[PDB]
Amino acid sequence: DSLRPKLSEEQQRIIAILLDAHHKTYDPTYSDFCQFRPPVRVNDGGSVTLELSQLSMLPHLADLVSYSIQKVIGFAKMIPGFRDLTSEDQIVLLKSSAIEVIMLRSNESFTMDDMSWTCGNQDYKYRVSDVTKAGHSLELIEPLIKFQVGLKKLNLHEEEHVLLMAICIVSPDRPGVQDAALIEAIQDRLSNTLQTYIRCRHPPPGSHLLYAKMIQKLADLRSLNEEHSKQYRCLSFQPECSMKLTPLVLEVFG
Ligand SMILES: C=C1CC[C@H](O)C/C1=C/C=C1\CCC[C@]2(C)[C@@H]([C@H](C)CCC(F)(F)C(C)(C)O)CC[C@@H]12
C-alpha cells in the first residue's frame, strides 16, 4: 500500500536550507569552547549543599548554553517561513523552545561510548556529574541521558535531525503565541517534508515508524523542559547565582 511521493523541488530546497543553516551554526570541532569561563570540577563524589555552595561547573555550562542559544537564534532565522512571523511570535517560540533545541543539538556530541557529551579533551567532556555541579538533580539528568540514548539509537540522517529541530522551534502550542494558525502552517510544511523524506530516503528497518518515534521525542522534550524550568527556578534562589549565568540565559529561563 504505502505510497512514496517524491520530494518536491520546494521540499528539497527546504532541506538544503536547513542543512546549510545547521552547518553555519553548529561547529562540530567545538573550537570556540576555550573562550567560555573555564570548567571547574570540585571534589563531589558524594552533595547538594556543596554543589550549591560552589556551583563550580555553572559559569562554563551557562556560557555553553548561552552560546548555543545564540546559535539557535541564528538557525531559527533561516527556517523557511520563520521570518514571516511577527517579531513577538518569533521571540515567544525561541524562548519556549531554547532548552529543547539545546538538548536536541547536543545529541551530536553525545556518545554512547561512555554516556558523555564529548567536545574535545577531558576538559570539555561533560558527564552527569558535571551537570550536578551546575546545580541540577537526577530528576532532570537521568531522563536527559535516557533521551540522548533513545535519540542516538534512531540513527537520524542529518536531514531528519535538522527538520526535527525546526519542527521543535515552530510549534503552535507554546504559551503566548498570537498567530497559531500561521505557525501551524509553517510547521506542517516542515512536518510534511520530514514524513516525505523518511518514506523516500530512509532505508528499512530503521524507517519503521520512524516519524512517530520522532514525534514522541518532541513530547519527551516538553517533559524535560518543564523539569529544567522547575530546577532552574530553584537554582536561581542561590545568592550570587546571577553572576554565574549570562544576561541571555537569565532572560530565556527567568
Ligand atoms: C549545548 C551543547 C551544544 C553543542 C555541543 O553538542 C555541546 C552541548 C552540550 C549539552 C549538554 C551537555 C552539558 C549539560 C547540558 C548543557 C544540559 C543542562 C541541563 C543545561 C543546564 C543550564 F541550562 F545550563 C542551566 C542554566 C544550568 O540550567 C542540557 C544540554 C547539556
Side-chain angles (χ1 to χ4, degrees):
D1 264 9
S2 171
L3 281 182
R4 301 167 51 173
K6 294 170 186 166
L7 292 159
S8 68
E9 189 270 342
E10 176 162 301
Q11 287 165 337
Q12 291 188 312
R13 182 166 76 245
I14 288 166
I15 296 167
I17 288 167
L18 295 178
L19 286 175
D20 178 61
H22 183 63
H23 291 156
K24 284 173 147 119
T25 61
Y26 186 98
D27 171 8
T29 74
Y30 316 110
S31 65
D32 290 324
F33 285 21
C34 65
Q35 308 220 323
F36 302 160
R37 288 171 291 182
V40 177
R41 288 152 172 119
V42 296
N43 303 317
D44 179 38
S47 167
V48 183
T49 302
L50 174 60
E51 291 150 14
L52 284 177
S53 181
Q54 290 293 320
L55 293 169
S56 69
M57 279 299 293
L58 183 58
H60 183 79
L61 293 184
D63 285 348
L64 169 62
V65 163
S66 194
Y67 171 92
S68 297
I69 298 170
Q70 295 184 258
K71 300 308 183 184
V72 165
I73 291 164
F75 175 78
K77 288 172 70 79
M78 296 188 257
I79 297 166
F82 193 77
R83 288 177 85 185
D84 296 330
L85 300 174
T86 63
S87 168
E88 311 87 82
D89 275 348
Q90 291 183 36
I91 301 314
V92 166
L93 292 177
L94 285 163
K95 290 191 197 180
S96 60
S97 65
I99 189 65
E100 303 181 14
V101 184
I102 271 52
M103 289 173 176
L104 284 170
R105 72 204 308 274
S106 81
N107 200 61
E108 186 159 347
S109 66
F110 190 77
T111 174
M112 278 174 77
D113 289 347
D114 66 353
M115 303 298 171
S116 69
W117 294 261
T118 294
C119 299
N121 65 171
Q122 195 64 21
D123 286 359
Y124 311 111
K125 183 177 203 82
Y126 315 109
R127 304 179 179 82
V128 292
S129 61
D130 298 314
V131 190
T132 62
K133 290 176 177 74
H136 286 289
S137 84
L138 297 174
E139 290 91 311
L140 172 63
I141 301 160
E142 278 182 353
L144 176 56
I145 295 290
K146 185 92 183 257
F147 171 86
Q148 294 295 333
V149 167
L151 181 63
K152 192 62 92 154
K153 284 171 74 63
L154 295 184
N155 296 302
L156 296 181
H157 297 192
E158 189 166 39
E159 294 86 342
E160 294 156 349
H161 180 74
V162 303
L163 280 160
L164 187 60
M165 291 188 291
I167 291 160
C168 180
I169 293 165
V170 185
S171 290
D173 66 325
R174 297 296 193 183
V177 299
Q178 286 315 296
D179 195 345
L182 182 53
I183 300 166
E184 185 169 352
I186 301 162
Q187 194 191 56
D188 285 347
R189 183 173 59 186
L190 299 166
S191 294
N192 290 337
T193 299
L194 178 59
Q195 290 185 256
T196 304
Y197 181 90
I198 292 160
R199 284 200 183 280
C200 287
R201 288 289 161 75
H202 202 297
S207 57
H208 183 56
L209 312 192
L210 176 54
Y211 183 62
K213 291 171 187 188
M214 289 181 71
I215 283 340
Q216 182 55 46
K217 289 284 164 171
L218 292 175
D220 295 338
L221 284 167
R222 304 298 185 111
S223 173
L224 290 166
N225 191 335
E226 180 183 12
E227 182 69 23
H228 169 83
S229 175
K230 290 177 192 156
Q231 291 191 18
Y232 172 92
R233 194 38 171 123
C234 296
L235 173 62
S236 88
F237 296 149
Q238 197 64 32
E240 303 298 339
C241 190
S242 71
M243 278 172 88
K244 301 182 175 62
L245 300 171
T246 76
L248 182 54
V249 165
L250 284 164
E251 190 210 8
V252 170
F253 298 138

